[PDB]
Amino acid sequence: IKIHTEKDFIKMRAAGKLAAETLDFITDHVKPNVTTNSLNDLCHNFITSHNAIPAPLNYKGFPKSICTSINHVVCHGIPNDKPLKNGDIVNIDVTVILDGWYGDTSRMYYVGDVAIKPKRLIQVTYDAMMKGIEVVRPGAKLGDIGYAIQSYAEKHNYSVVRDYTGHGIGRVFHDKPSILNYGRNGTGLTLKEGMFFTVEPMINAGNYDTILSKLDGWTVTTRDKSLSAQFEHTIGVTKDGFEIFTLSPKKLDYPPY
Ligand code: MET
Ligand SMILES: [Mn+2]
Ligand SMILES: [Mn+2]
Ligand code: NA
Numbered sequence: 380i381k382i383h384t385e386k387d388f389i390k391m392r393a394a395g396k397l398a399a400e401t402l403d404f405i406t407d408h409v410k411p412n413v414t415t416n417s418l419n420d421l422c423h424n425f426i427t428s429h430n431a432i433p434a435p436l437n438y439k440g441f442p443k444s445i446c447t448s449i450n451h452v453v454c455h456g457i458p459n460d461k462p463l464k465n466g467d468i469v470n471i472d473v474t475v476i477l478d479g480w481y482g483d484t485s486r487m488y489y490v491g492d493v494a495i496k497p498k499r500l501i502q503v504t505y506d507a508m509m510k511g512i513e514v515v516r517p518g519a520k521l522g523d524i525g526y527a528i529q530s531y532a533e534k535h536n537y538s539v540v541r542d543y544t545g546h547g548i549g550r551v552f553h554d555k556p557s558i559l560n561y562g563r564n565g566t567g568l569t570l571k572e573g574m575f576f577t578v579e580p581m582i583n584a585g586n587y588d589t590i591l592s593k594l595d596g597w598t599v600t601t602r603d604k605s606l607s608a609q610f611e612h613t614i615g616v617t618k619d620g621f622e623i624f625t626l627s628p629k630k631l632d633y634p635p636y
Contacts, residue, residue, distance in 0.1 A: 394482030395624025525562025
């Protein structure tokens with residue numbers, strides 16, 4: 380696990396800011412009848428016009444510049460030509476590379492008028508992410524992150540996806556260690572100043588089991604077809620706490636926006 384210094388923190392602040400600015404920008408474009416392919420092109424040109432690279436583009440063959448995951452899609456959805464429908468929920472997940480450093484962040488968006496139950500799932504997911512980030516400091520352990528997220532989700536009768544995790548990040552997209560979204564207090568490796576990683580819980584309204592698309596090699600869905608929501612931030616461990624690199628500059632942290 381790589382230990383970074385202040386010079387690298389400066390670089391990660393800039394990459395994370397741009398990733399978060401991409402998500403602020405896309406907000407007003409998420410409407411009924413818009414396709415995820417349209418949203419991908421909007422984000423692509425925003426990213427590149429800011430002197431940066433969309434990390435997902437051809438990453439392990441991924442065919443688009445962002446991930447867009449609708450309703451029972453858990454993560455890694457591929458932008459396509461289907462119109463978004465009133466009542467849908469969508470995760471938009473952006474990663475930019477700026478001067479060689481990766482900024483990774485996602486948020487949930489409402490499409491038109493959304494029902495009470497999807498809105499509850501979204502809110503719980505955001506809150507759970509923040510419970511996880513909030514334990515981070517040198518001497519805390521990875522399992523403390525997972526316990527905080529899992530406890531918060533499960534107290535609301537939701538489940539935590541096990542098969543996909545957060546990750547180290549910096550000059551690499553996906554580095555050590557794996558940041559599990561479930562766990563037990565006081566277990567796992569010890570956090571240290573200078574570590575960078577993501578916190579990206581996926582929370583299901585039903586059971587935690589997921590399925591990977593046999594057809595596109597990427598799209599993950601809930602096995603029970605229940606709704607799933609996700610938020611993500613890129614963070615760093617400081618001398619006595621954490622720093623989030625991907626905060627929305629416009630304070631568009633969670634919907635409604
Ligand atoms: C094809 S990019 C998959 C990236 C994943 N959504 C992440 O946040 O790491
Ligand atoms: Mn991401
Ligand atoms: Mn990530
Ligand atoms: Na979803």
